[PDB]
Amino acid sequence: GLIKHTEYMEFLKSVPTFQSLPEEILSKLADVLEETHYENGEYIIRQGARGDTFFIISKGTVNVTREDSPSEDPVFLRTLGKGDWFGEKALQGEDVRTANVIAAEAVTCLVIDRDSFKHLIGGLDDVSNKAYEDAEAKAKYEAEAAFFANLKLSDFNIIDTLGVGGFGRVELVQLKSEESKTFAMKILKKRHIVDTRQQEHIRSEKQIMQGAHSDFIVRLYRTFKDSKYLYMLMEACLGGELWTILRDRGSFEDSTTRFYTACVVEAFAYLHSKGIIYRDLKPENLILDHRGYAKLVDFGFAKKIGFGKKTWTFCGTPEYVAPEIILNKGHDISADYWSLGILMYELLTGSPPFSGPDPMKTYNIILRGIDMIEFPKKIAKNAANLIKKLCRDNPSERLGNLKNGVKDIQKHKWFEGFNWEGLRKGTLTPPIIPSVASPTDTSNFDSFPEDNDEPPPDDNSGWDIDF
Ligand SMILES: Cc1cc(C(=O)O)ccc1CN1CCC[C@H](O[C@H](CO)c2cc(Cl)cc(Cl)c2)[C@@H]1c1ccccc1
Ligand SMILES: [Cl-]
Description:
Layout: H1 4-12, H2 16-19, H3 23-32, E1 34-38, E2 43-45, E3 53-59, E4 62-65, E5 76-80, E6 85-86, E7 100-103, E8 107-113, H4 114-120, H5 125-149, E9 156-164, E10 168-175, E11 182-189, H6 190-195, H7 199-211, E12 220-225, E13 229-235, E14 240-241, H8 242-249, H9 254-273, E15 276-277, E16 286-288, E17 294-296, E18 303-304, H10 323-326, H11 335-349, H12 359-366, H13 381-390, H14 406-410, H15 420-425
Antiparallel strand pairs: 1-8, 2-7, 3-6, 3-8, 4-5, 4-7, 9-10, 10-11, 11-13, 12-13, 14-16, 15-18, 16-17
Helix pairs in contact: 1-3, 9-11, 11-13
The structure holds the ligand Cc1cc(C(=O)O)ccc1CN1CCC[C@H](O[C@H](CO)c2cc(Cl)cc(Cl)c2)[C@@H]1c1ccccc1 and chloride ion.
The ligand Cc1cc(C(=O)O)ccc1CN1CCC[C@H](O[C@H](CO)c2cc(Cl)cc(Cl)c2)[C@@H]1c1ccccc1 binds at residues 17, 25, 29, 54, 85, 88, 91-92, 112, 135-136, 139-140, 143.
């Protein structure tokens, strides 16, 4: 009873899932856990039964089967041993069982019912309850992956084209099996990737977007591949493209730009907190969802940088490249803060502050700096103030790369009256509200014809291995 608790505790510290949890949770768990015993061949659980109990194996092995029809043989799935657990769906509500768990020898479980677990979750506020939800969140993303891992391209159907370029195209795809589920599939010609030397830009794009979990960034759920293309299954943001909205409107009203800048500012708070530099900011990298909220799409130039490290790769559209990138000194996260001031200037006027007749001449007016620019009368004093602070030459002096970091940009006079929590909570009313009738409604995108041309060559070189 009192010494039982000391073994239950040392056993939970051996299980990889639980061992990392706080001792408050683990000792509280060791008090409530009841030890149940089974014999070889005994059904610990039966498919189709209703239950409220979760199991952890402390001794023995179990075989999990699942019969798919009365007049069909059973289907063996897996064998679970000591440290492994099952029945978990029973704790988070749903009590119906989907597979049989049979004892493959003498088995000993440590069992806990649904009530006993819910009653147990009452504990140390932002110490232990905080730490519990972090693991649950992390564990929710591995569950997500396995749902998508079972899928094939054959499980989707194409609705309409969302974008078409040299790369290939973006297509709205519907999950055949659940028609309410639609995604933005980005099909990419492997030849193009190869011809442009982008095998590593595309490998990182995958790694980052799948790793990212922000409401200001487009979700990349998984990837697919064939002999000719790469397929990136992403969340469908049906609000429309930001560059097609700016095109149609010319410029954006002061308060409209504030909302889209704020969305970017949160994306950058998230990305910079994980040591990732974005680089490719421009209106073609922002997409609104059905609500009218903007998300960062395209992580081609994005990079994972070491704490205290810089990069040297000269890249990006000339109009948006920072002085330290052109001058080939080092560049870091603060390069993204230069991009915010460019985006701002363009959204308010329809064009960026620096552009020449070729890349070289564009680079010559960029190194002259924001202080030489005669800001249009349409830019407000507060907006201009922020652009001049964001686009300073020395990256060390740049707003966002100071003491409070991103908070210094959130605290600017331009954001006086801006509900930053409303935006994060998702309760802030956006400036332009898209009309989206259903998941298949592509009415806020342009119409592109179907590709008539022949498919690109096959490429089985093996760089695509990870996809
Ligand atoms: C895979 C998964 C999916 C979801 C979801 O999609 O809702 C949530 C959590 C999990 C992870 N999830 C699976 C069952 C075992 C385990 O959850 C159960 C029930 O939440 C649990 C049982 C015990 Cl006795 C102790 C703990 Cl801390 C948690 C695990 C988990 C580990 C640490 C912290 C929280 C949760
Ligand atoms: Cl997420």
